[PDB]
């Protein structure tokens, strides 16, 4: 009976591929033959934030485009002021191996996680002064890779046990569980309206979930290695995925397939972070070869480089008003560009 | 100055930075080690002399030196993704059992292949390995009624004990192929005190070698 269901699955995938081929008429690079190029983009290191000692693994902006969080492997989680290069808090951690950090949209809580299989949630506005651990969520069997806040009551985490979870903070119970991947999931991004999200695993696949019911809705498979970072387009109808084969692609939700691929022969190294700009015209991608590249999101031609790091960039993120981009690498420093 | 108040904030920031520097100085004293092995390798033994899911942190102090041991065999996940966080360690402790007679594919060959994999990794090119050969007395009983040709097809020589052990040790040390690291060997046995001093000497030697080469004194 197993072979019958295998044949049925083959029929299903043939139907899917046929439909995807039928709905395709011309490529997006053929549509953009007339629109003018954006020119080269030059950016300067405006601020350098030198507080840590070990390598930096995560970073996330705040909502007001001024506050920042850094998570590094020396056991510290220190929030910065971007305009005045100050430190406003210094949170000592329990486990020194951290791979993710988060900042709440309202600025009241932050999160952290790592190889200790526990997502910790810290309270910043305590009446008694210092910052404290509010909960310690522990339901996974593998390590955590990416944690994102929905609101002050619920969080979404992605782990190494090939599963993702939605938590409720006041209770500590894993409200809904997302499953279906074959290998480790290593990235996650929330849509602007926070109703549905995407995740990127190490089986060269990215899936689209919905947080209300918990059902995988679309599967996209183009890559040839592990996918390491994911971010949406601003309008919530496309996203960009970075992998370990020197390639990053743009997938369309409505068309249900790939649109462009961004690779140039000079680069062999893999991606570690991907983000967009405010309007979606530019695409920023970190790399293992110690630099950051800017692509034309509609023309697919490099428009500049953000060099200036002694070691590989591991985190990357832009603000909510499009003013600055922050890059953090294993050299224990963070940079701000404008 | 034109910084109004706006002035206590900088004082708090400097206090925080002082705390970061003091914590770094305090945490610079300890020595970091990583523990690797395979099933039935016997790493639990070398752990149990130390004590007297996720990552476990066995902890001990010997002769005014602060030690940390990380056993990550419990992390049953993809290895390529969580080893890079474990670079900058002082040394890697490797456990090999002198019992290759049975299939898990031979266990000894699996251990040799895994040693080759970990020795030539991109991140661990310059991290010295301290090597432990367990079951010293069991292999002594075994070799009395078995040849080493079964483990290694190419072996030629005696079927005694010391020579057989030396052949295995040489085969393992054959894999380093780099000029800036060394493999230290100690043949442990059950009921054997001192396996902590075999680590103290190695760690001191590694630290002084790294200091000599770092200050360009070579």
């Amino acid at each position, epitope marked *: 009976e197993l072979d019958q269901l295998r044949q049925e699955a083959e029929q299903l995938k043939n139907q899917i591929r046929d439909a995807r081929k039928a709905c395709a008429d011309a490529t997006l690079s053929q549509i953009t033959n007339n629109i003018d190029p954006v020119g080269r983009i030059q950016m300067r290191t405006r601020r350098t934030l030198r507080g840590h000692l070990a390598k930096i693994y995560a970073m996330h902006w705040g909502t007001d485009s*001024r*506050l920042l969080v850094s998570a590094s492997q020396d056991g510290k989680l220190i929030i910065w*002021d971007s305009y*005045t290069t*100050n430190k*406003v*808090h210094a949170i000592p951690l329990r486990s020194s191996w951290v791979m993710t950090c988060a900042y709440a949209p309202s600025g009241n809580y932050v999160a952290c996680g790592g190889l200790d299989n526990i997502c910790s949630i810290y309270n910043l*506005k305590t*009446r*008694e*002064g*210092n910052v404290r651990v509010s909960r310690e969520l522990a339901g996974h069997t593998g390590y955590l890779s990416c944690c994102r806040f929905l609101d002050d009551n619920q969080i979404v985490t992605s782990s190494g046990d090939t599963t993702c979870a939605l938590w409720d903070i006041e209770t500590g119970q894993q409200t809904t569980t997302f499953t279906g991947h074959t290998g480790d999931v290593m990235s996650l991004s929330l849509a602007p309206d926070t109703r549905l999200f995407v995740s990127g695993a190490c089986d060269a696949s990215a899936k689209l979930w919905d947080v209300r019911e918990g059902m995988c809705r679309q599967t996209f498979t183009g890559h040839e290695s592990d996918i390491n970072a994911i971010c949406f387009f601003p309008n919530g109808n496309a996203f960009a995925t970075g992998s370990d084969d020197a390639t990053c692609r743009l997938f369309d939700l409505r068309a249900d397939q790939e649109l462009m691929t961004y690779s140039h022969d000079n680069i062999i190294c893999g991606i570690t972070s991907v983000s967009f700009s405010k309007s979606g015209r530019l695409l920023l991608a970190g790399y293992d070869d110690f630099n950051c590249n800017v692509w034309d999101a509609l023309k697919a031609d490099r428009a500049g480089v953000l060099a200036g790091h002694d070691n590989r960039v591991s985190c990357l993120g832009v603000t909510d008003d499009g003013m600055a981009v922050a890059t953090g690498s294993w050299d224990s420093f963070l940079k701000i560009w404008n | 100055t*034109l910084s*109004a*108040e*706006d002035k*206590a*904030a900088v*004082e*708090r920031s400097k*206090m925080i930075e002082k705390n970061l520097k003091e914590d770094g100085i305090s945490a610079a004293k300890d020595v970091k080690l990583l523990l690797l092995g395979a099933g039935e390798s016997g790493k639990s033994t070398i752990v149990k002399q130390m004590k007297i899911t996720g990552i476990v942190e066995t902890h001990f102090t010997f002769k005014n030196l602060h030690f940390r041991l990380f056993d990550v065999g419990g992390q049953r996940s993809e290895r390529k993704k969580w080893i890079h966080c474990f670079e900058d360690v002082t040394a890697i402790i490797f456990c090999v059992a002198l019992s290759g007679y049975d299939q898990v594919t031979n266990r000894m060959h699996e251990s040799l292949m895994l040693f080759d994999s970990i020795c030539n990794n991109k991140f661990f090119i310059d991290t010295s390995i301290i090597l432990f050969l367990n079951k010293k007395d069991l292999f002594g009983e075994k070799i009395k009624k078995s040849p080493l040709t079964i483990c290694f097809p190419e072996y030629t020589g005696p079927n005694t004990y010391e020579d057989a052990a030396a052949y295995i040790q040489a085969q393992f040390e054959s894999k380093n192929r780099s000029p800036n690291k060394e493999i230290y060997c100690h043949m442990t046995c059950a009921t054997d005190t001192n396996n902590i001093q075999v680590v103290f000497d190695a760690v001191t030697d590694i630290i002084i070698a790294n200091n000599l080469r770092g200050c360009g004194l070579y």
Partner: single-chain antibody
Amino acid sequence: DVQLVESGGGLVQPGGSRKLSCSASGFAFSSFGMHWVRQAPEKGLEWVAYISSGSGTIYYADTVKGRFTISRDDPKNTLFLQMTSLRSEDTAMYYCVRSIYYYGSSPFDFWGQGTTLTVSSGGSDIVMTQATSSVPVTPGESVSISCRSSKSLLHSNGNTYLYWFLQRPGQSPQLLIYRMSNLASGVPDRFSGSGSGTAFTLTISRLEAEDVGVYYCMQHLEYPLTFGAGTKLELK
């Protein structure tokens, strides 16, 4: 709970000396700045001293420098004020406040209950005026109070340092607005503020009987800190 209790006050003949202590229990005392704000038998508030976290910076009022001294002993979480050559103008209630300072913080949030001290018979400051002395109000009505400064309070950083307090009868003052717009934690949403530069207002909507007292405005642009006379509110 957060608690600040003072003790060590009494009737002392002029020219004497005395030591005051402020005991703290319920917060991270070592990471706070502490002030001393005093109040005459029936007059308003007057700032006295200040000590920072780590005891780095100390400031004094010009009228009390040299006679007094301020110290803290953070292992035992107690604050001190040692005063010598007492004068007849120093008969006052003495308070103890906490003044955490960072981006987005809420300084002057908790005020102690104070101690009574009585003594027997024997030009660049930012003067701030509150022309109204009292306003009679009826429950449920909307009332607006004013505080006019001398120097414009808008620093180049975009900030504007003005605070508002409320002193209920027979109690200790609370904090309502910090930096001219930010409503404090625990205070009702009824209160709101506005202004531009030197003209300041505080708007109360649907006032009830629980918010009757005297309102003070404080400047924090530069030391020394200055208060106002305070506008009183009374029923009917």
